[PDB]
Each structure stands twice: as structure tokens, then as C-alpha cells.
Amino acid sequence: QDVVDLDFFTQEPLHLVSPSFLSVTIDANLATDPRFLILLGSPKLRTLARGLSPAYLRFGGTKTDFLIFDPKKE
């Protein structure tokens, strides 16, 4: 038989998650792609991203530790 009874605990919240609980990353590796500006400029991608707001966007990954800021580069 395939009918299942649920039990619910509803007396008080067991935990409180952030409003940004479901957040996302962009991998550091993407900033080595020649077309980074085209990619993240996409209005379509921004629309998709807005849908997950509020959220954190974390920029990082393995390449975090092999990237150096160079203020002169174009």
C-alpha cells in the first residue's frame, strides 16, 4: 500500500534561516575567461539572478588563491 501519514511539529520554529538561505556562487575561474564582461553584462542573466534575490553571490573557488589584483591592467 502506497498511502503514508505525515506528522508535523509546528509549536515553535526549530531554526531560523537567513532570508538569503538559498545563495549562489560565481567561480573565480570565470574571471580568467576573455569574455567575462560580456557574460556578466548579459541582461538575460541579470533577470535570472534577480529572481533569486535576496541572496549572497560568492566569488571564489580554487582560483581564489591564484588571482592577483593588478590596478594598471586594462
Binding site: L40, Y56, L67
Partner: protein
């Protein structure tokens, strides 16, 4: 395998404006492998970046290092947790001297808590825990290179996540009790994802289960690897089209609130039928304070029918059942919501997410190998007001 490369002011601007225009909060990972002859962190490059960001008025949160447990393998440099902790203290002093003196700092972005990683996290938190705002760690279930379809559907694989979470909290509660714990990078499979699996409907069992368990167990934020990128585990592909996990994520966002409750199955079979319960998201215009959102995963090969308990048995329920669009079944990259394909309306417009109202008092139908959200209307749960 890892060479140094540089990034520019332009790149920083691209990233910030993407986040800013999207309503997202940017967390930027700084390079921890810049070292003095003493093996201290050399902060000079981070200083350049901080000053630049300050000068543009960018509100940004910071991390330092990624998977420092792997530095010996990646770079032949070993940095112990104590030293890393001192490096975080130095970064925190720079932030306190910056234009954004209250900017947040997260770390240490360790991998999952194997014996050696657990010891590094422990010594890190003893040394640097006072200055981090949340503890970050990473989790992947499988190696993408060898992952199988069967692994994506296996509750014994899903269940391994529980033990990693418990180990992280054991370390944190022994050192910095009460500090928030975040999953700072997570996905199905590492090595960029499992080909033909991590970008499909079948990926959603892992994603939704991880969300459910994370919320249930006290994790405050989960960061999905990756929104957009070269790996198979992307939410959005290289044509800027959303994959099933995007649509799953959007539904979760719209329906699932911040207050976590609990559901379980009376039977106690409890492995292939997986159930989670929160208060409904109060920003959803359709629903009101006191409503509940149940979400469920059915990894059986037959339909299961769920019965709600008193006093919710006769309430109006809105169903949001996700199924793949054929012919590729679980390996599909397209999904339907209550029988309608989810697709962008145009480049600026997400579709509406249409509910299916059920007959009051009916049992909740959950087909084989599927997941669904169920909003219980007028539930009037005092804990959710």
C-alpha cells in the same frame, strides 16, 4: 596545474555591477597564498583591492582563502589553522580601518570535515574565530568523473551529508559556541560536475534534499556552486538558459520561508520518501501569515500518497509538482510545473509559477522520482505569525 593570473579594475566593476543590478550581496574571496618569508599572509595586494573598492563605494563582504586544507596539494605550501587564524585577524584590522568598517568577514572555507580538515578548522577557530561573522565550509557528495545516475537517486548517498554537518557543528560547538555556520560552496559533484547528470532534473533530488537537511540541522546559508560557469553543476547554461535546478531554486525562493519546522513519516520507512516543513515565505503575495510550506522528495519507483495530519487535513492545499519534460526522463534539461513547461517569457520576464489547487481533504500525490512543494493555506500556525 595552477598558475598565477591577474585581474583588473574592469573585472571588479563587472562583478560588482552584476551583483548590484541583480539585488545580490557580493562576497569576494581574497588570495591567501601571498606569503612573507616568515610564512605570514602578505596583505599588500588585498590592501590595493580594499582601497579601490572603498574608492568606488562598493559594499562588499570578504573571505580569505579557499580550501586551505588542500594548499599543500595545490601549491606545495602548508599553512596550519593557527597561522590562518592570525591571517584573518590581520585582514579584520584592515577592514576596521577601511571606509566600510563594519564589513563582514567569513571563513575559512574548508572542505568537508575529514580528520585533517577537522583539526585545521578547530585550530583556525581557536585562533581566528573571534573575527569571523560566520563559519564557512564546503560539501560535494561525489567525484563528477565517476558519479553514476544511480548515485544521484540513492538515499544512502544523500544521507552522507548528515554526518558531515554533524561533524562541523561538533567542531564549532567545542570552540566558538553559537557562531553561525554557512555552506560556502556546495554541489552534487566536484571536478566541475557529473557529465549529463549535474545539469539535469535528476540533480534536483540532491539539491532539494541538501536544502531541506541544511535548514533542518541549523545551517543558516547555503551557497550553490555555480550560478553560471563552465561546470555541469551550473544553474544557467552557456546560452543563458535556465536548467531544472534554476527553476527548483526559484520555486524554493518563492515558497519556503525562514522559519524551519519538522515533518516526518508515521510509518518510519523514512529513506526514499523525504519530507521537510517550513512556514510559507511571507513575501509571496498569494499566501498569508500562518501558512505552511511542505516539500517532499519521492525516490521510490511508484507514486506515494501523503495524508496531512489534524488540524490540517481539510485545508486548501496548493501543489507545485515538478516533473521532467520528455523524452529524456530524469536526464532531461527541461522541467514542467504542474504539467506546464517552465520557460522564460522573454529575456526580461520570468514566467508566473502557477499552482494547482487540490480538492480539500485529498491526499497529496507524489509520483515516482519526483519532488513537489505543497502550500497549506489558512493553516493559521501561530509559530508562523
Amino acid at each position: 596545474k595552477f598558475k598565477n593570473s591577474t585581474y583588473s579594475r574592469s573585472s571588479v566593476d563587472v562583478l560588482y555591477t552584476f551583483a548590484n543590478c541583480s539585488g545580490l550581496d557580493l562576497i569576494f574571496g581574497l588570495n591567501a597564498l601571498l606569503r612573507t618569508a616568515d610564512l605570514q599572509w602578505n596583505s599588500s595586494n588585498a590592501q590595493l583591492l580594499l582601497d579601490y573598492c572603498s574608492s568606488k563605494g562598493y559594499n562588499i563582504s570578504w573571505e580569505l582563502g579557499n580550501e586551505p586544507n588542500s594548499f599543500l596539494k595545490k601549491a606545495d605550501i602548508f599553512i596550519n589553522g593557527s597561522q590562518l587564524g592570525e591571517d584573518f585577524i590581520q585582514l579584520h584590522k584592515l577592514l576596521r580601518k577601511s571606509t566600510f568598517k563594519n564589513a563582514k568577514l567569513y571563513g575559512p572555507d574548508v572542505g568537508q570535515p575529514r580528520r585533517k580538515t577537522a583539526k585545521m578548522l578547530k585550530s583556525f577557530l581557536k585562533a581566528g574565530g573571534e573575527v569571523i561573522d560566520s563559519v564557512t565550509w564546503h560539501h560535494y557528495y561525489l567525484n563528477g568523473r565517476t558519479a553514476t545516475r544511480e548515485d544521484f537517486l540513492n538515499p544512502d548517498v544523500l544521507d552522507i551529508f548528515i554526518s558531515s554537518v554533524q561533524k562541523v557543528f561538533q567542531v564549532v560547538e567545542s570552540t566558538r559556541p553559537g557562531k553561525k555556520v554557512w555552506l560556502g560552496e556546495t554541489s552534487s559533484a566536484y571536478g566541475g560536475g557529473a557529465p549529463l547528470l549535474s545539469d539535469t532534473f535528476a540533480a534536483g533530488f540532491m539539491w532539494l534534499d541538501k536544502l531541506g537537511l541544511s535548514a533542518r540541522m541549523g545551517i543558516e546559508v547555503v551557497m550553490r556552486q555555480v550560478f553560471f560557469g563552465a561546470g555541469n553543476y551550473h544553474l544557467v547554461d552557456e546560452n543563458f538558459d535556465p536548467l531544472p535546478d534554476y527553476w527548483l531554486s526559484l520555486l524554493f525562493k518563492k515558497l519556503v520561508g525562514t522559519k524551519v519546522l519538522m515533518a516526518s513519516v508515521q510509518g518510519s520507512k523514512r529513506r526514499k520518501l523525504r519530507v521537510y516543513l517550513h512556514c510559507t515565505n511571507t513575501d509571496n503575495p498569494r499566501y498569508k501569515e500562518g501558512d505552511l510550506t511542505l516539500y517532499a522528495i519521492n525516490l521510490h519507483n511508484v507514486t506515494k500518497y501523503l495524508r496531512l495530519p489534524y488540524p490540517f487535513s481539510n485545508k486548501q492545499v496548493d501543489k507545485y509538482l515538478l516533473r521532467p519534460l520528455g523524452p529524456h526522463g530524469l536526464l532531461s534539461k527541461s522541467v514542467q510545473l504542474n504539467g506546464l513547461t517552465l520557460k522564460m517569457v522573454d529575456d526580461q520576464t520570468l514566467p508566473p509559477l502557477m499552482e494547482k489547487p487540490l480538492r480539500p481533504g485529498s491526499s497529496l500525490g507524489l509520483p515516482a522520482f519526483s519532488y513537489s512543494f505543497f502550500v497549506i493555506r489558512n493553516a493559521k500556525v501561530a509559530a508562523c505569525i
